[PDB]
Amino acid sequence: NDCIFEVKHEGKVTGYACLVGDKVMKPAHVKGTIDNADLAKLAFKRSSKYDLECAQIPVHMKSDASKFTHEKPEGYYNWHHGAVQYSGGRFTIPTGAGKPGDSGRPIFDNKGRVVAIVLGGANEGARTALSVVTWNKDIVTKITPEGAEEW
Amino acid sequence: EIEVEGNSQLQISFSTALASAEFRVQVCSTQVHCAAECHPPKDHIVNYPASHTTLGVQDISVTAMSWVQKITGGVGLVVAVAALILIVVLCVSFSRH
Amino acid sequence: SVASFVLLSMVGVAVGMCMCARRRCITPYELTPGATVPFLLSLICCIRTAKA
Ligand SMILES: CCCCCCCC/C=C/CCCCCCCC(=O)OC[C@H](COP(=O)(O)OCC[N+](C)(C)C)OC(=O)CCCCCCC/C=C/CCCCCCCC
């Protein structure tokens, strides 16, 4: 659980919003008002280009947030459902580990910092490529494989 | 038609409805350009129909309409810089990823 | 009346297209967590009250 908040429409949970550094990351294509009432009050500068909605976190009460990093050396990374491998440029998971509703879950490195946030996936065989919102220095770069549905 | 010979000048009379005179006088196959500022009459009404052609069409305003060109050029310039900034931003954002 | 209306619409469109330029050129820096715009871009774009 730690520092991720579920987002639901009525009683149906649709996604999760992560607290990375100083921003309340959340993907645009999910519909919800966030479980916390205080976070719902925030104003999100949403962008359709990156499928993201972000706002300044209330550091006065929620300064505790996941650390982030920009470099992604190829190897293995861990998230809630299994572990994921940076396939020289693509995020790949076993086909089962991906399912609609997981959109907005972050992913961590070996050292425990976020490097991306997942939106959906497409599968070529047993493994499923991931559509994530990674970031270089001071800039985010959405990545999307071919024929990737939105979770 | 008039009589011309020598190294002197002549004189004519014309009737116009334009505030700024701008017209070419065909004088025996050789044209000439005449320009002057016309002034309004003093008498409100008269007893004969106008000798000149008709009301100046909306195309022909008076010089010192240059205000129109000035303001329209300023607005067009502002729109041009806005469009250039928008298109350069759109291209650089297209370069992303 | 027509000239004034068209000119005001044109200056308003210039302002709006300027506004749309700020939104599309500042969200990539605004969306990134722990980001900081370069000094030159901070001068150009007027949107600086929110240091995001
Ligand atoms: C700081 C601010 C300072 C700025 C100063 C402000 C300046 C203010 C003034 C401008 C002066 C406007 C006054 C002009 C009035 C003259 C009268 C007139 O104008 O009336 C001319 C005739 C007579 O009227 P009527 O009722 O008998 O005719 C219509 C017949 N009925 C009704 C059956 C259709 O009417 C006609 O024939 C007209 C027929 C239609 C003509 C179309 C015009 C052609 C151009 C169109 C736009 C294309 C752009 C061109 C640009 C090219 C540049 C490269």
Numbering used by the authors:
A (entry chain K): 111 to 261
B (entry chain C): 343 to 439
C (entry chain G): 372 to 423
Paper text:
Alphaviruses are spherical, enveloped RNA viruses with two-layered icosahedral architecture. The ∼70 nm virions are composed of two icosahedral layers with an inner nucleocapsid made up with capsid proteins (Cps) and outer membrane-embedded glycoprotein shell formed by envelope glycoproteins (E1–E2). E1–E2 heterodimers trimerize into viral spikes that mediate receptor binding and membrane fusion, while the nucleocapsid (NC) encloses the viral RNA genome prior to the glycoprotein envelopment. Alphavirus particle assembly occurs at the plasma membrane (PM), where spikes progressively assemble while enwrapping underlying NCs.
Particle orientations were used to expand symmetry and generate the 60 unique ASUs (four E1–E2–Cp subunits) images per particle for further classification analysis. Due to the close agreement between the models of class average maps 2 and 6 (rmsd 0.59 Å), particles assigned to those classes were pooled together and further refined to produce a map at 3.09 Å. β-Strands in the E1–E2 ectodomain and helical pitch in transmembrane (TM) helices that were lacking in the initial map became evident. Our ASU model reveals additional putative residue contacts within the lipid bilayer region between E1 and E2 TM helices and Cp. While E2 C-terminal tail and Cp interaction was reported as critical to virus assembly/budding based on mutation experiment, our structure shows that E1 C-terminal residues also contact Cp. Our atomic model reveals extra contacts between the E1(1)–E2(1) TM region and the neighboring E1(4)–E2(4) TM region at the q3-i3 trimer interface. From the contacts of envelope protein and NC in virion structure, E1–E2 dimer 3 in the ASU contacts a Cp molecule that is part of a NC pentamer, while E1–E2 dimers 1, 2, and 4 contact Cps of an NC hexamer. In our CHIKV ASU map, E1–E2 dimers 1, 2, and 4 have a single linear density in the hydrophobic pocket ∼17 Å long that sits below E2 subdomain D and runs roughly parallel to its length, and E1–E2 dimer 3 in the q3 trimer has two distinct pocket factor densities with the top one equivalent to the ones in other three E1–E2 dimers. The hydrophobic phospholipid tail of phosphatidylcholine was built into the pocket factor density of each subunit. Additionally, our CHIKV ASU map has unveiled distinctive double lipid-like pocket factors inserted into the notably large hydrophobic pocket formed by the membrane-proximal regions of CHIKV E1–E2 TM helices.
